[PDB]
């Protein structure tokens, strides 16, 4: 008796930026996020009457 | 130096003097932080590093 085939898988590598989900996001690589304490985005909405 | 009075004559003399070293010790203690010794070896990442 003998073997006929030894078959394995190759894992389908799907990263974040190839998927269409990144249309709902804005991707920035940020070197040292370990050093950040807080983030801040500051709006100023002037309302006409 | 001899002289002509009734004093006894003088035989020649010899002096033998012994001196020795003194040992002295010195010690100073330095502490170095474990993080400071460690991150001399950690790799460069970013300009803030």
PDB file of C-alpha atoms in Angstrom:
ATOM      1  CA  UNK A   1       0.000   0.000   0.000  1.00  0.00           C
ATOM      2  CA  UNK A   2       1.160   3.553  -0.661  1.00  0.00           C
ATOM      3  CA  UNK A   3       0.115   7.167  -0.290  1.00  0.00           C
ATOM      4  CA  UNK A   4      -1.661   8.925  -3.134  1.00  0.00           C
ATOM      5  CA  UNK A   5      -1.591  12.585  -2.120  1.00  0.00           C
ATOM      6  CA  UNK A   6      -0.771  14.837   0.801  1.00  0.00           C
ATOM      7  CA  UNK A   7      -2.704  18.081   0.407  1.00  0.00           C
ATOM      8  CA  UNK A   8      -2.848  21.153   2.644  1.00  0.00           C
ATOM      9  CA  UNK A   9      -4.440  24.573   2.697  1.00  0.00           C
ATOM     10  CA  UNK A  10      -2.980  27.976   1.930  1.00  0.00           C
ATOM     11  CA  UNK A  11      -4.678  30.594   4.081  1.00  0.00           C
ATOM     12  CA  UNK A  12      -6.567  33.200   2.058  1.00  0.00           C
ATOM     13  CA  UNK A  13      -4.896  36.449   3.141  1.00  0.00           C
ATOM     14  CA  UNK A  14      -7.400  39.316   3.216  1.00  0.00           C
ATOM     15  CA  UNK A  15      -6.182  42.644   4.584  1.00  0.00           C
ATOM     16  CA  UNK A  16      -8.267  45.627   5.660  1.00  0.00           C
ATOM     17  CA  UNK A  17      -7.528  47.913   2.744  1.00  0.00           C
ATOM     18  CA  UNK A  18      -8.519  45.481  -0.037  1.00  0.00           C
ATOM     19  CA  UNK A  19     -12.068  45.120   1.272  1.00  0.00           C
ATOM     20  CA  UNK A  20     -14.673  47.742   0.408  1.00  0.00           C
ATOM     21  CA  UNK A  21     -15.259  48.432   4.121  1.00  0.00           C
ATOM     22  CA  UNK A  22     -12.565  51.124   3.933  1.00  0.00           C
ATOM     23  CA  UNK A  23     -14.944  53.361   2.011  1.00  0.00           C
ATOM     24  CA  UNK A  24     -16.621  53.862   5.405  1.00  0.00           C
ATOM     25  CA  UNK A  25     -13.320  54.783   7.054  1.00  0.00           C
ATOM     26  CA  UNK A  26     -10.269  57.017   6.720  1.00  0.00           C
ATOM     27  CA  UNK A  27      -7.019  55.159   7.310  1.00  0.00           C
ATOM     28  CA  UNK A  28      -3.949  56.868   8.767  1.00  0.00           C
ATOM     29  CA  UNK A  29      -0.892  54.948   9.904  1.00  0.00           C
ATOM     30  CA  UNK A  30       0.346  56.406  13.180  1.00  0.00           C
ATOM     31  CA  UNK A  31       3.815  55.351  14.372  1.00  0.00           C
ATOM     32  CA  UNK A  32       3.567  55.845  18.126  1.00  0.00           C
ATOM     33  CA  UNK A  33       0.002  55.402  19.348  1.00  0.00           C
ATOM     34  CA  UNK A  34       1.477  53.955  22.510  1.00  0.00           C
ATOM     35  CA  UNK A  35       2.537  57.478  23.474  1.00  0.00           C
ATOM     36  CA  UNK A  36      -0.817  59.237  22.956  1.00  0.00           C
ATOM     37  CA  UNK A  37      -2.986  60.158  25.917  1.00  0.00           C
ATOM     38  CA  UNK A  38      -6.024  61.648  24.150  1.00  0.00           C
ATOM     39  CA  UNK A  39      -7.350  62.664  20.782  1.00  0.00           C
ATOM     40  CA  UNK A  40      -9.268  65.806  19.998  1.00  0.00           C
ATOM     41  CA  UNK A  41     -11.367  67.131  17.134  1.00  0.00           C
ATOM     42  CA  UNK A  42     -12.821  70.561  17.685  1.00  0.00           C
ATOM     43  CA  UNK A  43     -15.863  71.945  15.871  1.00  0.00           C
ATOM     44  CA  UNK A  44     -17.138  75.532  15.822  1.00  0.00           C
ATOM     45  CA  UNK A  45     -20.603  75.770  14.308  1.00  0.00           C
ATOM     46  CA  UNK A  46     -21.733  79.316  13.534  1.00  0.00           C
ATOM     47  CA  UNK A  47     -25.528  79.360  13.115  1.00  0.00           C
ATOM     48  CA  UNK A  48     -27.256  81.931  10.884  1.00  0.00           C
ATOM     49  CA  UNK A  49     -30.718  83.280  11.635  1.00  0.00           C
TER      50      UNK A  49
ATOM     51  CA  UNK B   1      84.693  63.272  66.864  1.00  0.00           C
ATOM     52  CA  UNK B   2      87.247  62.419  69.536  1.00  0.00           C
ATOM     53  CA  UNK B   3      88.643  64.911  72.039  1.00  0.00           C
ATOM     54  CA  UNK B   4      91.329  65.099  74.694  1.00  0.00           C
ATOM     55  CA  UNK B   5      89.286  64.977  77.906  1.00  0.00           C
ATOM     56  CA  UNK B   6      88.663  61.988  80.178  1.00  0.00           C
ATOM     57  CA  UNK B   7      85.582  60.833  78.262  1.00  0.00           C
ATOM     58  CA  UNK B   8      85.372  57.272  76.933  1.00  0.00           C
ATOM     59  CA  UNK B   9      86.176  56.692  73.235  1.00  0.00           C
ATOM     60  CA  UNK B  10      83.397  56.247  70.691  1.00  0.00           C
ATOM     61  CA  UNK B  11      82.873  53.090  68.651  1.00  0.00           C
ATOM     62  CA  UNK B  12      81.247  53.368  65.233  1.00  0.00           C
ATOM     63  CA  UNK B  13      77.461  52.982  65.131  1.00  0.00           C
ATOM     64  CA  UNK B  14      74.766  51.714  62.765  1.00  0.00           C
ATOM     65  CA  UNK B  15      71.046  52.440  62.406  1.00  0.00           C
ATOM     66  CA  UNK B  16      68.494  50.156  60.762  1.00  0.00           C
ATOM     67  CA  UNK B  17      65.019  51.506  60.021  1.00  0.00           C
ATOM     68  CA  UNK B  18      61.998  49.496  58.815  1.00  0.00           C
ATOM     69  CA  UNK B  19      59.037  51.043  56.983  1.00  0.00           C
ATOM     70  CA  UNK B  20      56.010  49.410  55.360  1.00  0.00           C
ATOM     71  CA  UNK B  21      53.099  50.310  53.091  1.00  0.00           C
ATOM     72  CA  UNK B  22      49.546  50.955  54.218  1.00  0.00           C
ATOM     73  CA  UNK B  23      46.663  49.610  52.163  1.00  0.00           C
ATOM     74  CA  UNK B  24      43.702  51.846  51.391  1.00  0.00           C
ATOM     75  CA  UNK B  25      40.420  50.998  49.690  1.00  0.00           C
ATOM     76  CA  UNK B  26      37.858  53.132  47.857  1.00  0.00           C
ATOM     77  CA  UNK B  27      34.337  52.330  46.678  1.00  0.00           C
ATOM     78  CA  UNK B  28      31.518  54.191  44.971  1.00  0.00           C
ATOM     79  CA  UNK B  29      28.041  52.880  44.157  1.00  0.00           C
ATOM     80  CA  UNK B  30      26.102  53.655  40.991  1.00  0.00           C
ATOM     81  CA  UNK B  31      22.466  52.798  40.351  1.00  0.00           C
ATOM     82  CA  UNK B  32      21.164  52.533  36.803  1.00  0.00           C
ATOM     83  CA  UNK B  33      17.474  52.093  36.063  1.00  0.00           C
ATOM     84  CA  UNK B  34      16.346  48.852  34.464  1.00  0.00           C
ATOM     85  CA  UNK B  35      14.407  50.721  31.790  1.00  0.00           C
ATOM     86  CA  UNK B  36      17.467  52.839  30.984  1.00  0.00           C
ATOM     87  CA  UNK B  37      19.698  49.777  30.540  1.00  0.00           C
ATOM     88  CA  UNK B  38      16.984  48.079  28.488  1.00  0.00           C
ATOM     89  CA  UNK B  39      16.092  50.751  25.934  1.00  0.00           C
ATOM     90  CA  UNK B  40      19.742  51.250  25.006  1.00  0.00           C
ATOM     91  CA  UNK B  41      19.148  47.935  23.188  1.00  0.00           C
ATOM     92  CA  UNK B  42      15.580  48.395  21.932  1.00  0.00           C
ATOM     93  CA  UNK B  43      15.265  49.235  18.265  1.00  0.00           C
ATOM     94  CA  UNK B  44      14.593  52.586  16.634  1.00  0.00           C
ATOM     95  CA  UNK B  45      10.992  53.067  15.550  1.00  0.00           C
ATOM     96  CA  UNK B  46      10.197  56.741  14.965  1.00  0.00           C
ATOM     97  CA  UNK B  47      11.879  60.182  15.262  1.00  0.00           C
ATOM     98  CA  UNK B  48      10.312  60.564  18.717  1.00  0.00           C
ATOM     99  CA  UNK B  49      12.178  57.379  19.725  1.00  0.00           C
TER     100      UNK B  49
END
